[PDB]
Amino acid sequence: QANMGQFRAALRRIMDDDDWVRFGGVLRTVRVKFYDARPPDDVLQGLPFSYDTNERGGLAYATIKYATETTIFYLIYNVEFSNTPDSLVLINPTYTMTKV
């Protein structure tokens, strides 16, 4: 698909259809973390692959690599008496991209 130039398009099409994607079949080490606030943008919304492109001598080269680590995180909600009933609602949602 990278050779035909359809990798990113195919991934976007699959994700927009509410489906699931599995990369390979290699065992992956699992870490466990706990959070009391909104987690950073690394563990949250982090692609499990890398896709690079270079050009040498008029020829295009592509590099595709799969990650070997994953993270299971538990997010705990803390609220305060001054919060309004619609304080946590945002105009647009925040996306998460990993399930274990």
Add this chain to the structure above:
Amino acid sequence: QRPERIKTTPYLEGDVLSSDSGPLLSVFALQEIMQKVRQVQADYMTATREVDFTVPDVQKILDDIKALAAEQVYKIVKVPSISFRHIVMQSRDRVLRVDTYYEEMSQVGDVITEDEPEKFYSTIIKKVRFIRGKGSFILHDIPTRDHRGMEVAEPEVLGVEFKNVLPVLTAEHRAMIQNALDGSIIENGNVATRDVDVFIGACSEPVYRIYNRLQGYIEAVQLQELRNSIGWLERLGHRKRITYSQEVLTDFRRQDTIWVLALQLPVNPQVVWDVPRSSIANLIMNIATCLPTGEYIAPNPRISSITLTQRITTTGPFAILTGSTPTAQQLNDVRKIYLALMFPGQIILDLKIDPGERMDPAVRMVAGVVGHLLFTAGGRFTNLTQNMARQLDIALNDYLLYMYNTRVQVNYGPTGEPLDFQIGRNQYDCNVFRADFATGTGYNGWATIDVEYREPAPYVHAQRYIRYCGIDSRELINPTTYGIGMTYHCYNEMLRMLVAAGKDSEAAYFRSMLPFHMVRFARINQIINEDLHSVFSLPDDMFNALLPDLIAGAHQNADPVVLDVSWISLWFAFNRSFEPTHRNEMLEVAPLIESVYASELSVMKVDMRHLSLMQRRFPDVLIQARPSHFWKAVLNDSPEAVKAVMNLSHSHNFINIRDMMRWVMLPSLQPSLKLALEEEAWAAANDFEDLMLTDQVYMHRDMLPEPRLDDIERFRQEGFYYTNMLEAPPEIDRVVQYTYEIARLQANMGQFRAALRRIMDDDDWVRFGGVLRTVRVKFYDARPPDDVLQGLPFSYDTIKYATETTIFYLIYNVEFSNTPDSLVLINPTYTMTKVFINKRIVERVRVGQILAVLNRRFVAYKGKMRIMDITQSLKMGTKLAAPTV
């Protein structure tokens, strides 16, 4: 990272003795080969031509060959070269136009003479190369102009120069020529996103042909050929089991890039092996390019001795030899032995004797046993000469009959041959250990298959797999037997015979040493089957025919190289193993070098083939011709690196006529861009009138014209010129024919001049045909020198038939002061030589037809395009994303 290099038991771990690599061993082999012949020729009286046996450095030659691949045989230009020029008289109505191509051709080479064939061949080669160089170009970013709502090509891109003609002519013709000039347009000039500009210009045929051929080749070779080359490289790397990275190649091509590819990977192997007397050079190149680098490893010292207590140790039978240390000569002999082992049929060993060296007699006896287990003399190939086999058999006989312990019963046989006896309490027949090359009883390959065929190789000419002593490389990963069960036939029989003869300690030593021996031979097999696979390896038919020719003593095309070793070298070699550590430095570049070498050889062969027929076409010019003459002519105009490769063993001092003639007629060829252009250049040059060489030269007595100048203006307007160029050859009935032999015979007898004058006074023509001549072109404004007007086709020194001749165009100029009969003389002036050429070199043309020459299509890329060469990208490590079939 290599699974076969993982050691889990200290049996195979030992000290490091030395190291060697490909670049050292190649020059070492060359030095030994040349030293042998120099010593032999010095020791005895001989009679031959003096040849200096030097040794070159192969690294510089390989670097030069690699650098040769970056050259380009094409150019990128903005405008084409000017092809037509004009000359103006006093007239303001007519001019005369000249094709500059023939003018530039007339001066390109040396003068063709009668008795110098090599210069003739050199001149022909230079003319052909000049055509190829002139005709190969690509147009890029030409100038244009906007006019009348469309694109118009500028006058500078057309191949016509006529600026000096405008100021003389009148107003109406100026308007006409301006409109005609503005009438040259670019097709599809009013559409955006156009990729290329197409227009009409003027050009000459021999270079237009080359331009069309190059454009077609550029259009044809594209992504598919690159994919095929990368796929073949992938298969070769799969066989050689190299490691790939995560980066892959994609067939995406930009919209503003044009690829130029000049070479192909699946090289025809025959082109390499067709060169006469080239076995040694091929072997040297194979060693230099494909041999890995490693180190020599000694066996574990615990194998021969075990210490039960701090005070008591067992003693090995050969403890005195193990304490020895090799000198320089013995180490060189060990290197020779391993080099002979790695190349089965191409290097053969022989015994060396030195009167000044003194050694213990036991050394020869032990070497006799070792050699039977180390070498191969089987029914497929051999590693040693028949004399060496006889010496080893005698040594084994002497060792067996020498009993330094209790004697045992022995029965001798009727014949006197060595090893013809039965020994021991159990009568063991020792006759099977005598050499027999038809079946190979006494050595490795006794009852084993040492040559097999598995799967179609990437190189089509070498399909064999070598299996020394029946072991396979895969046994180092997935064994098929226990450690105590590793054995083969000859070694087992040797141990049984040793036990039968009462030498128990030696048998125990060899039984302990056996697994090390088999592992060594398995590693050698792995080296031979994978790393050394190249086009320089010997093809299958020659490998199969090597041994029967050695037995029968017949002539051999690929004669094996014979090297000399000493007795103790056998013992030193049996206690060593070769452990590769790194691959060769230029393993991944070798196919490109191979392709460059093949392409150069192919273009040389094409040139020689086309030059071979000149003697048959024109017998009178090449009387003293030889094949060696055009051989030297072609080699003098060839890259030096290829000649250096092809002269690695000084083979050019020994080739004869028959070898050259047999090589030039073999049909193998290797396609390339350079060959594609060379073929077209030769095809264009096959017409000799395009090389400005002709034989249509005539003699005829003619008067120089003397017009009457009654009206100066009218005579000026008419335009007047004189030439000896014939517009049509004379009639057959009015011409007599001469020949080189007839002319020479009549000149010797002294009747040539009288016959010529008798013919001339009869107002007839004579033709000096049969011999090519060099033709020059000249233009004259006033009366020319007398040696040009009255030149003759022949000259005296007993005459020279071939002489360069000139075609002159005389232009008449008059002024207003000339009397109406001012240029008539009392006596005529005579001119003899005339030349007929069926080409329109110079033409007197009216002004209205000056633009009539623009009639050839040109196609030029726009400024936003890029032209880049991708030949250097054909490396071994590249893996493409979408695999090919």
